[PDB]
Each structure stands twice: as C-alpha cells, then as structure tokens.
Amino acid sequence: ESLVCNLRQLKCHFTWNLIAEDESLDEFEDRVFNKDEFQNSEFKATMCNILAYVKHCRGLNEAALQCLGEAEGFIQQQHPDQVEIRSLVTWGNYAWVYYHMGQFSKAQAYLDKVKQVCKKFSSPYRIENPALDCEEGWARLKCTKNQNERVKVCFQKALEKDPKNPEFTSGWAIANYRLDDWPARNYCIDSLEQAIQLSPDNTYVKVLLALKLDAVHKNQAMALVEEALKKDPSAIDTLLRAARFYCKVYDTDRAIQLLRKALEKLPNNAYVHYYMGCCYRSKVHHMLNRREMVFSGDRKKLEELIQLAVNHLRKAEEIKEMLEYSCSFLADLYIIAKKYDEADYYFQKELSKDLPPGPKQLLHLRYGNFQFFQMKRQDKAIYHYMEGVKIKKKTIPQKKMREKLQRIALRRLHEDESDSEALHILAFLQENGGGQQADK
Amino acid sequence: SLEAILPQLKCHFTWNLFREGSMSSHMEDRVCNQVEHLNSEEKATMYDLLAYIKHLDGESKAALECLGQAEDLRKSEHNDQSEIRRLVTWGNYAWIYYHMGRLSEAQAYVDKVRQVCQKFANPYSMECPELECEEGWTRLKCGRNERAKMCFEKALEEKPKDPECSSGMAIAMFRLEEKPEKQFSVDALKQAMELNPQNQYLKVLLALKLLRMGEEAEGERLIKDALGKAPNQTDVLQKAAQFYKKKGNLDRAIELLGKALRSTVNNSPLYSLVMCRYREILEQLQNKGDADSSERRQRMAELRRLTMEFMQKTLQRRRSPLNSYSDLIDFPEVERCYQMVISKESPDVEEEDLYERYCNLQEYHRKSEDLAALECLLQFPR
C-alpha cells in the first residue's frame, strides 16, 4: 500500500533504528533509564518519545499515545516561538502508532500536516540522497589530515540507506582502519568552560567540570560543587554526581548524607545501595594502607560495607549475574575480613559467570594470587595460572602472568611438587621467546 | 540576489575541507597521481576535486578544463544515479563564474540545478539546525556518543554561538573520554575485501594491521601476494616499504622506495621520504664503528646525487601561491642533508652552485604578497 511507502520516508524514532544487538528490551530499558538514572534530559521531549517507542515495542499503544501527548505538552511549554519546527518528530510518531493500531484517517491527517510544514519551510536547491553523502567523504579522505570522524559518519549514513554496496563498504573499512591506527584526541576542559560561561544556571556542567578536571583548583574546584548544590537543591543530577565526587574527597559523613537524601527519592534503585558500598570501600582501603594506630573503626566500617553490598546483591543481580561486577568486591572484602568460607563461596559464584577474555584472565591472576596466599597447597595455584595463560589475549595482566610463570619456574627449584608441569611452563616460555625474537 | 542563492548549494565551496588549518605538500601531485589505474566513476570524482585545488591557486581558466572532462564521463553513462551525482559539478560552475565576474553566465546553471532537484525532491523531510539537535539528544541517551558529537558539531557551523548546542557537545566529549568508543578493523577489512576481489590496496592495509597484532607469517604472506599482482602501483609500494621498516629491515625498505620513486612523473612528494631514510641508515653505521666502508661510500654517493636533483627540480618550477607554501615546508629537511653529505666529504665546488641561489629563492618566498592573501582566506595561522 502507498501508506507504508510514504511512512518510510519520514524521520522519527522508529526509522532511526535505536535498538540493535540488545538481547532483550529489558536490558535496553534498564541501561537507558535505571543505570544512568542521573542524566534525565535537557530537552524533556526526548524521554517521552523514547518511552513511547519502548511501550509500543512491548505491545501497549494507549500508554504510547499518553506519553506522546505529554511530550507535545512539554514542547509547547518550553518553546512557544518555534512550536511548528520542534513538533515534527512527534507527528511522525503519531502516524506510525496510529497505522499500527489501524486508524488510517488520523495517520493520513498527520502525514498531511508534516507535508504542509515541510513544503512551507523547505529550500528549492538542497536535496538529501546517499550518493552525495558518498561524494562528500571521498572528498574528505583525500583532503583530511587527522580528523577522520566525520568521514566514518558520512559513510555510515550511505551504508545504512543501502547496504551490500562495495564502494560504501570500502570507504567505511578505510575510515575504521585510519581511526584505529591513530585515535582521535579530545579535551573537555575548554568546551566545559565555554558551556558554563555562555549559559549559567545549568548546575550540571559545573559538577562535570569539577570531577573530570581542575584537580589543581582543589578547594576552588569544590566551590563549583557547593554552588551547584546551592542553585538547584531538587536536581537528582547534581545530587548523585556530588555524592560520587565526595568519595574522591574521602568525606563519607557528607557523601552518605547526600546518598540517603537520594534514597529518599528512589527507594527501589539498586545502584544507590551500590554507591554507598563503594563509599565505605574506598575510605577503608585508603585508611588501611598507612593510618595504622588503633585500627578499630575499620571492623565496623567493613560490617556496614558488607551489609550494604549484600543489600545491593539481592536485587538486580540475581536476575542477571553479569551486571554490577560486585562479586569481586565481595570476595576481596571477605579476604580483608579474614573470613574465608563465604569468600570462596562468593568467588566461585563469580567464576561461573561468563566474562570477556581480559576480565577472565584478570580473574585467573587474582585468584591465583589468592590460592597462593591463603592455601598451603601450590597445585591449585599453578593450575589456575595455567588456566589464565590458556587465554591468548594480549594485555599487561597477561604479562604479569608470564612473570608468575617465571616465578613458578623458580618454585620448581624450590619445591619438588612442580615436577613436569614446570617443564611445560618452560616450554611455553621458550615458545614466547621464539615469538619475541620473531617480532624482530 | 545571486549572492544569497550560492550558499544553499552543495559543492566543494560549501564544505569546510580545510577546517583544521593544516595543509599537506601541494595536492597537485597527490590528487592526480595515476589516471590509468582507475575506472570511470573514480575519474569523475578526481576531476571535481582537482578544479577546486587549481582555482585556489589562481588558474581559473585551467579549472574550467578540469570540470569539462568530468562532465563528459558522467554524460556518457546513462543511469538514474548518475544524474544526481551531476549536481556537484554544476555547483562548481556557479561559484567559479561568479568569482570570475561572468555573472550572467552563472545564472544559467543556478536555473538548471533547480529542475533536477525538483524531480527527485523528498516531500516529507527537511534539513535545519533545529532538527540536528533533537537527533543529537536521542543518540546521546542510547549510548552512541561519537554519532552524537557530530550532530552538535555540524549544528554549530550554521549558528556560531548557541547556548543549547554548546552544552550538549561538552557532555558528549566528557562521556567519550571516560570510555572510548570501540573500533572494528579486521572484521571490516576482511568483509570489504570479499566484495572487491581485485583491489590490492586493501590487502596491504590488513597486513599492516596483522603485523602489529603479533602475527608476521600471515602479514608477510599477504604482502608478497599484493606486490606480485600489481608491481607498478605507487600506493602499494609505499605501504609495503613501511611494513619492512616497522619489521626491522631497512635494506629492503630502501629498495622499495627507490622503485616507487621511478614509477610516475609526479614524484615530488616522494623526495622527502627517501631523503630521510638514507640519513637514518648512515647514522646507524656510525654506531657499528664502520667509519669507512665500500658500502658506507655506496650510500654517501647516492645521497649526493639526490640532493642536487631535488634542488635543481625546485628551481625549474612555475611560481604560484601553493608552490611557495609547499617549498617552505621542505626547506628544513633538505638543508640538514646538505652539510652532512657534501660539506664534510670535500670542499664544495663553487662553480656548480645549486646553492646560495636556492637559499635566495627561500628568502623571496616569505616576502611574496600572493602567499599572504591566500593564507588569510584559508585562515591558516602563520
């Protein structure tokens, strides 16, 4: 039908292909809403549109209509002068949702409204078509020096519009190679300063400028945080970001009060419990290195630390084992606490979960060190180091693990239990030697 | 009224190709290196860009000739998409005539571009700064920071100062530096090589990737294949010589560059590369206590003849704003090799010259007024 042919040409959230390579809609909604619960939005219409799209993908349409109505209300509330231009995407969302439901008359009417606005505001000479988006980009490859970021976007647009085309694919591959070889260097200090000076009362970029940079500012950097809290006390943005910043300050009495205020807002959240666990952990590890003296408060601090960590773990992690990566902190917490049986329980809970090869070999290295320190036996430790070296990822923990294998070669001289496994160790090390003289 | 129409077109004159403020050795030789190794579609694109470079250099009449050749190739082929690609060429006529003063002629092409754009119009979408910010916010929340950076950046070009776009761009920059964006290289290069089976330039790019990843047997096998099939292509030879330099073999790297230098007539950019490599190998042999060798002499003599040939080549060249700008860049390198090769081995022959005249030319380059005018238009800092 001609209706879908016309609908394909609109630009809106449905066409932009927001979700991709996400195993479920639950992961998408969690990562967009709960995880970065802070950001919210500078332009209130984006959140309602995203929520409406997710609601439609769930199977409910009336909630989508309500959310889109709220989005239009916010658009009218904010910008009265440009109400015609800013309302263009929401009309496309109405058209798509109504077409999905079946009321074709409303979809046709909204299509006519969009056409009228476009015809009134369009330019007679410009045109959009991926052929030009490819010519622009073959110009850039030859003319550019070190900024290859817009080349890749220009080629992605054309590739997305029409895939399996040799020319677009070659351009995209070349851009990716150039970006991989020499990464783009970016600095937020000047942009953040300009953003603050142009538009005050933002009370967010202030906090970002404080935590990210201006370490030399010290108390002057803290002044930004105080002014940000003073200007907008009801902003969850500044609240959460200031509380995390105080962890670097090592002033929990202040950070925890802010986090309790935040918990008064959103009780069901789990990351609120996570941050409190990070706050006790950073302070107790800092005071463990050299404070010494009475060393009494630390046992209590560890007690509330572990209780908040468990209160975190009971939610949002039993459903998905991978998320929050907390089990390593739980394990090391028990190791400091000198209690070992729940320590091995929780570490074994961590180990059963799949991880990327880098984190996997890091886990093998850490538990090799553990299996060495707390257990008399050595065979388990050499086995776990063998497990780690079986992974072929190239990274600096892997180099430290080669150093561990050299140590085990020494332990062959020291302990007789090493036996032929040390022979396999030296075989692997001479293979690595052949490789490194091959690199020459 | 014609002044307002021009900025709305899409052509090389509205893209900010030289935004960085940094330019390479003059592109005349780089843009049109080899023309017998390309197809019709790539030939048309090269001529479109070659006109823009020439026009900035002052040769307006030659610029029209470059555009005409690309016009013929696109007209010869009959296809729907070929008509749309023609819109870029017609944008260059309007800008060149208007600058050249033939205002009546430029009105004809502005008329012609309108009918073509009218037939292929899209009646359901438009482009404006307000539509780039709304897309920028959505891409920010979904976690695609790199794509959100460029939606805000392109919107600031239209409006130089805007309190809303400026705030958004800083947030995307902060998120990127916290966690870099992933890049896929070996997957994309392998996929592209399967669609294009007769391209050898993509072969040496993958091999250079594999060498750094830790595998040389895979890398070296790929390069030996590429050199055999196309042994007279400048692009492959430079990349192959780079691979051996990274591997540790400088003798073979020298031989490949020497082959590449004798490939085309546009060998000016390659002079700087070869000159540096001889200096590196000669300095190494000092460390090996090899102060005198038939082999050490076998290198010093070659550097002697190249220095004279490059210096002779520079003097016999037409004076242009772009030639002067590129000459100043190569001056520090050619000077350093001068005292190393000839002033030490033997007293310089006075009557042979090629010096104190080349140096005299350098002083005249700085005083040129035409270079000063060009840098102001391109906004290149001094």
From Swiss-Prot, chain A:
Gene3D superfamilies assigned: Tetratricopeptide repeat domain
An annotated Gene Ontology molecular function: RNA binding
Inducing or repressing factors: By type I interferons, dsRNAs and viruses.
Record-level GO BP terms: antiviral innate immune response; apoptotic process; cellular response to interferon-alpha; positive regulation of apoptotic process; response to virus
Subcellular location: Cytoplasm; Endoplasmic reticulum
Major subcellular site: cytoplasm
Keyword vocabulary terms for this entry: Acetylation, Antiviral defense, Apoptosis, Cytoplasm, Endoplasmic reticulum, Immunity, Innate immunity, Repeat, RNA-binding, TPR repeat
Pfam families membership: TPR_19
Cysteine pairs bridged by disulfides in the record: none
GO cellular component, one term: cytoplasm
Repeat positions for TPR: 45-83, 84-129, 130-165, 166-202, 236-269, 270-325, 326-356, 357-395, 396-437
InterPro entries assigned: TPR-like_helical_dom_sf, TPR_rpt
Oxidoreductase in keyword set: no
PANTHER family: INTERFERON-INDUCED PROTEIN WITH TETRATRICOPEPTIDE REPEATS (PTHR10271), INTERFERON-INDUCED PROTEIN WITH TETRATRICOPEPTIDE REPEATS 2 (PTHR10271:SF4)
Function field: IFN-induced antiviral protein which inhibits expression of viral messenger RNAs lacking 2'-O-methylation of the 5' cap. The ribose 2'-O-methylation would provide a molecular signature to distinguish between self and non-self mRNAs by the host during viral infection. Viruses evolved several ways to evade this restriction system such as encoding their own 2'-O-methylase for their mRNAs or by stealing host cap containing the 2'-O-methylation (cap snatching mechanism). Binds AU-rich viral RNAs, with or without 5' triphosphorylation, RNA-binding is required for antiviral activity.
Comment field on protein domains: The C-terminal part folds into a super-helical structure and has an extensively positively-charged nucleotide-binding channel on its inner surface.
Subunit organization: Domain-swapped homodimer. Component of an interferon-dependent multiprotein complex, at least composed of IFIT1, IFIT2 and IFIT3. Interacts with IFIT1 and IFIT3. Interacts with STING1/MITA and disrupts its interaction with MAVS or TBK1. Interacts with EIF3C.
Full protein name: Interferon-induced protein with tetratricopeptide repeats 2
Organism this protein belongs to: Mus musculus (Mouse)
Swiss-Prot record, chain B:
TPR repeat coordinates: 87-120, 129-162, 165-199, 234-267
Induction comment from the UniProt entry of this chain: Induced by T.gondii infection in the testes and uterus.
KW Methyltransferase (keyword) present: no
Keyword field contains Cytoplasm: yes
Pfam families, A to Z: TPR_19, TPR_8
Biological processes annotated in GO: cellular response to interferon-beta; defense response to virus; innate immune response; negative regulation of apoptotic process; negative regulation of cell population proliferation; response to bacterium; response to stilbenoid; response to virus
Stated role: IFN-induced antiviral protein which acts as an inhibitor of cellular as well as viral processes, cell migration, proliferation, signaling, and viral replication. Enhances MAVS-mediated host antiviral responses by serving as an adapter bridging TBK1 to MAVS which leads to the activation of TBK1 and phosphorylation of IRF3 and phosphorylated IRF3 translocates into nucleus to promote antiviral gene transcription. Exhibits an antiproliferative activity via the up-regulation of cell cycle negative regulators CDKN1A/p21 and CDKN1B/p27.
Name by which UniProt lists this protein: Interferon-induced protein with tetratricopeptide repeats 3
Lineage of origin: Eukaryota, Metazoa, Chordata, Craniata, Vertebrata
Gene: Ifit3
